[PDB]
Design a protein around this nucleic acid. Sequence first.
RNA 1: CCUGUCAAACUCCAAACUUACAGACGCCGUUUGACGCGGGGAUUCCGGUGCGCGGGGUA
RNA 2: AGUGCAAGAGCAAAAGAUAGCUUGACAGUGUUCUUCCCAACGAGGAACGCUGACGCGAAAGCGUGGUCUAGCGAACCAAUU
RNA 3: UUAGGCGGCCACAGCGGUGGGGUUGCCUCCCGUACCCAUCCCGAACACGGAAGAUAAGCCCACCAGCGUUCCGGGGAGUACUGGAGUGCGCGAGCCUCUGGGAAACCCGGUUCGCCGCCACC
Lengths: 140, 154, 156, 95, 186
Amino acid sequence: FHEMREPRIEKVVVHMGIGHANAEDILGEITGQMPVRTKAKRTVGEFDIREGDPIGAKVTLRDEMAEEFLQTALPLAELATSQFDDTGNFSFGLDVTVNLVRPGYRVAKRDKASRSIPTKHRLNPADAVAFIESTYDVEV
Amino acid sequence: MHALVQLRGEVNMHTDIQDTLEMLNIHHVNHCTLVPETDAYRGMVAKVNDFVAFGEPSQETLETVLATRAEPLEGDADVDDEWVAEHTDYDDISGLAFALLSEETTLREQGLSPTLRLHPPRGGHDGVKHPVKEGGQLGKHDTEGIDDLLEAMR
Amino acid sequence: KPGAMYRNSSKPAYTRREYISGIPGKKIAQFDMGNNGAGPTYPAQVELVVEKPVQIRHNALEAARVAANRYVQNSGAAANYKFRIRKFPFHVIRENKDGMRAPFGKPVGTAARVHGANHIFIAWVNPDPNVEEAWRRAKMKVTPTINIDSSPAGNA
Amino acid sequence: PSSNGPLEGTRGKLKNKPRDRGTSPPQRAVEEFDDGEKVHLKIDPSVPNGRFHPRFDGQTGTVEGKQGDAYKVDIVDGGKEKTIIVTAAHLRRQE
Amino acid sequence: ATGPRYKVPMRRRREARTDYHQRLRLLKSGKPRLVARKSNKHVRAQLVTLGPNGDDTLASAHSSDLAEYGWEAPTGNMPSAYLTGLLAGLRAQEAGVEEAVLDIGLNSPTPGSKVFAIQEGAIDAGLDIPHNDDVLADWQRTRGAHIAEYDEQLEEPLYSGDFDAADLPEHFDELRETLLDGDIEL
RNA sequence: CCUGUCAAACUCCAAACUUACAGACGCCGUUUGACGCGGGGAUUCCGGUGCGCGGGGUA
RNA sequence: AGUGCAAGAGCAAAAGAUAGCUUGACAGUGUUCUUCCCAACGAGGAACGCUGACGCGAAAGCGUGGUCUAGCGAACCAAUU
RNA sequence: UUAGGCGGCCACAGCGGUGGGGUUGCCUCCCGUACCCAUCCCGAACACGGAAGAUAAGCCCACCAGCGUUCCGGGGAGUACUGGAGUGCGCGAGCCUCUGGGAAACCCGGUUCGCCGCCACC
Ligand SMILES: [Cl-]
Ligand SMILES: [Cl-]
Ligand SMILES: [Mg+2]
Ligand SMILES: [Mg+2]
Ligand SMILES: [Mg+2]
Ligand SMILES: [Mg+2]
Ligand SMILES: [Mg+2]
Ligand SMILES: [Mg+2]
Ligand SMILES: [Mg+2]
Ligand SMILES: [Mg+2]
Ligand SMILES: [Mg+2]
Ligand code: NA
Ligand code: NA
Ligand code: NA
Ligand code: NA
Ligand code: NA
Ligand code: NA
C-alpha cells in the first residue's frame, strides 16, 4: 500500500513578482537554472497597461535541484499551519512555493487517458505537515 | 361497413371536406354510399362527420335500400334479385347485401354504381344543426338509428 | 381614466422591461398585511376569488386593498390576522395620447392579469370574520364580480 | 419580415438544444450516399460548412451525383424543381 | 452532471482517448487508417476501416506476437516498432489492403518517433501510405543502433539478464529478413 | 429554509396543427390523353364580408 | 470568456489564447442556391467544384479573407492591365 | 475482454461513494536520460531507454441512487390547449355541446451507476 502513497516534492516554484527584470540574475544563482519572464494580463493604473510585458520571473525546480534548494530555503522560513494548502501545498517568503503529491500524479498530467486524482488519493494539509516536518525542521 | 348519407349541401363547406365526400362517391345531398371500416376510411368519415349521417345498417334495411335505390354502373335497369343473379356473384339481393356488410365486395366490383341516390326522408329528419346525441341527425348513428333514416329515405 | 380602457386581456402580454421604458411605479403600498411575523397558523382562511379573467390596474388593486385592510381595523392596528394580495401588476399598459398615425401608445400604467377562479386576496383569521366584510368592500373596487370563499373553517 | 437575409427567422431551426451543443460526431459527416437515395435535409447547427438555404430544412430529396465531397440533391420547392449542394453532415437516409 | 442544460462530452473524449477533430480529418481520405499505438512495454499497429456500427480492423500486429517469429529482445523500442509496422503491413497486404493514412492518435508527431517507425515498416511491407521521408528515423536508429551504443557505455548490462550484453541490431535484420518471405500468418 | 408573482422580442418541457418524401386505400387518367412541355390571346395588380388566428387603436 | 461592430446563432485537445511561420485577401473558369418562397427579373451575395500556382503540416488536411446573416451600384464616357 | 486497441450511439453513459484485482499475456503508476525528440525555466510534459518496486492512483470487475439524466406505472388529467361542426348559452368578455387529437409542472413507486461493433488475447 504505502511507498506508492508516501508524499514527495514535485516542483518548487521560486518567483519574484516585480512590477516591470534585473532580478532574474539572483534567481538563477539562488536556484541553478534559467528563470522565466512573467508577462501580465489586463491593463491597470499601476502604469501596468501593457498586456504582454515582462513583470517578474519564476523558476520551477524538480528533483535534486528542488531539494538542494529547499535545504536552505526552508531553514530561512519559520511559518507553518494555516499557511498550508488544502492539497498539502504551501508557499513562504521573493516567493518560494512547494507542490507536494503522491506517486501516481502523472495520471493527471499526461496527455493520453489523463484523469484527475481522486480526493482519497489527494494529499491533505496534515499528511503534508508530516512529510516535510519529518525532514529537518518543525511545524507551526 | 357503414352507410354514409350526405345531409348538408356543399355551399360554404370546406373544400377538403367536399373533396373527401367526392372521393367517397357522393356528389349530391341525400346520396348514400357503403364504406368499409378501415383506418383509412375511418379517418375520412371523421373529417366528413358534420355534414353526414352514418352507421352500420341491418341486413334487411340494406336489402330494402338496395332493392329500391341501387343502379347499374350505367342505365335505368332495376337491380332486383334477377338482376343481381344474372349480373353479380350472388344469387339475390340478400346474397349481395350480406357480402357488402361483411365487406367482402363493393358496389363497383359488382358493376353497380357506388352510390345509392335516396329520396328525401319521409316525415323529415331530426335536423342538420345538431348531432345525434343532441337530437339532431348528424354524425354516427345506432343500427336502429341509421335504419330509421335509411328506411325513411328508402 | 375608465377601467373600460384596460380591463380586457385581448392584447399581447407586454411585460419585458428590457424593451419597455418609462413605466410608472406601482401605487400598491404593501402585499403582506397584519401579523406578517406570524405564519398561516390560523383556524379560518377566507379568500377573494375573481370570477372572470380581467386586467386590474394597480389603481384598483390599491383602492381595493386599502378599503379592505383599512377596514380590517375593526380588529385594530396590531390585531391578530394576516392579509395577502397575491397578484402583482406586470402587464404594462399604454395610451395613444397625429390621430391614428404612428399610434403605438406610451406607458401610462400597469395592471395585473387575473384569471377567472384565482384568488386575488387571502386573509387569515380566528373565528372572527370581519374579514368577510373586509371583502364585500374589496370586490367593490375591482372590475369583476367576485366570490368570497372560506377554506379551512367548518365552524359555521 | 423586417429584413430579408438568409437567416431571417432562423433563430429556432439553426440553434441547438443545450445538450446537443458542441462539435458533432464525424461518423455522419462522412456518410456515403448513392444516386437515387432519398435523403432528409436538416442543418446541423454545430456544422458551419456544407449548408443549404434554411428554407429547405425539412425537405426530402434524391441524391443525384455529387460535387467535390458535397452532394447534389434534387428537391421540389412547391412546384419548382431545384438542385441543392449539401454535405453529408446535413443529411440522413430516409427510412 | 449539474442540470438538464449541462453538456457531457462524447465518451471517448471524457476518456481522453480520441481526438475527434483529427479523426474527422483522417476519415477525409476515404482510406484505411494505419492506427499506430503505444504502451510502456509494447507497440500496436492496426489497419482500420469504417463500419456501420463502428470501426472494423482488417489487419493488425502487436510487438508481443513478434517473438512468435524469433524475437528475443524487449518490445517497447524502435526496432520493435518498425517490425510491428512491417508485420501489420504484411498481414494487411494478405487482407487485400493496399493504401493507408497514418493515424497516430494523441501521440506527438516527433521526428524519429516510434509511430513514424511503425509507418516506415508498414510502407516497406507494400502498403501505400502518404508520408515524409525526412521525418523518419535514420535506418540505424531503426535497427536499434542507438541502444547498442548506449550499452557500449556499459559497466552494467543495459538488459537485466534478457538476451546478450552488448545487444544485437543484427537480431533486427534477421527478423526483418525472416518476415520478407513465406512463414505462417503472413 | 420558508413564503408571494410574471414574459411578443425567456425556455428544462410541450401539443393540436402545418409541412417534405414514400407505401397503401380512395378518387382520377391512358378513344373524355391526365401529369407535363411549347406557343397565341387576355383580363387583372381600388376589393369587400363572415368565421378562426391575429398586430395597432378607448373604440 | 473570447471571437473587430446590431441582433440572433456557431465554437473548448476550438472557430478562442499564445508562439512561430506565411500572404489562399492568389489567377482562370464554372455548377447550384440566393437576390425574386411558391413563380419570371439585373447588379450584388453565398455554398460547392474544376484548372493553374502557392502557404503550412509528418500526414490526412486546412487556406476560394475576418465563424454565419449588413458594409453596396446598370448603360454611355474616362483612366488603368 | 484476470486488466488491451480502434470505435458507434453520444449522460440509460454525468456527479459523488463502497468493496475487489495483478511472479505476466496485459495496462499502469514506476525507474532512468547516451541517443531521436523536448521544455520562451524545469526528461513535469513531450520523446527515447528500461524493469528494482507497487496494485496506493488510473484502469478492469462487482455494487450503492443522495444529485443530474432516460424510460415506465399510478395520480394530476382526458384537466390546459386544440383541427372540424352548431338558429347551444351569454349585454359582453367569454362559455357550452358533439366529433377528432391531447400537454406541462408536481407528487408517490419502479427503471437508470451505460448498451453495442470490429480486432487482438490462457
Ligand atoms: Cl440551398
Ligand atoms: Cl498511443
Ligand atoms: Mg348511372
Ligand atoms: Mg311534409
Ligand atoms: Mg328541421
Ligand atoms: Mg419563432
Ligand atoms: Mg404556421
Ligand atoms: Mg469561411
Ligand atoms: Mg450619364
Ligand atoms: Mg480609373
Ligand atoms: Mg486496489
Ligand atoms: Na404628423
Ligand atoms: Na365588482
Ligand atoms: Na453537435
Ligand atoms: Na447573380
Ligand atoms: Na518574451
Ligand atoms: Na490499481
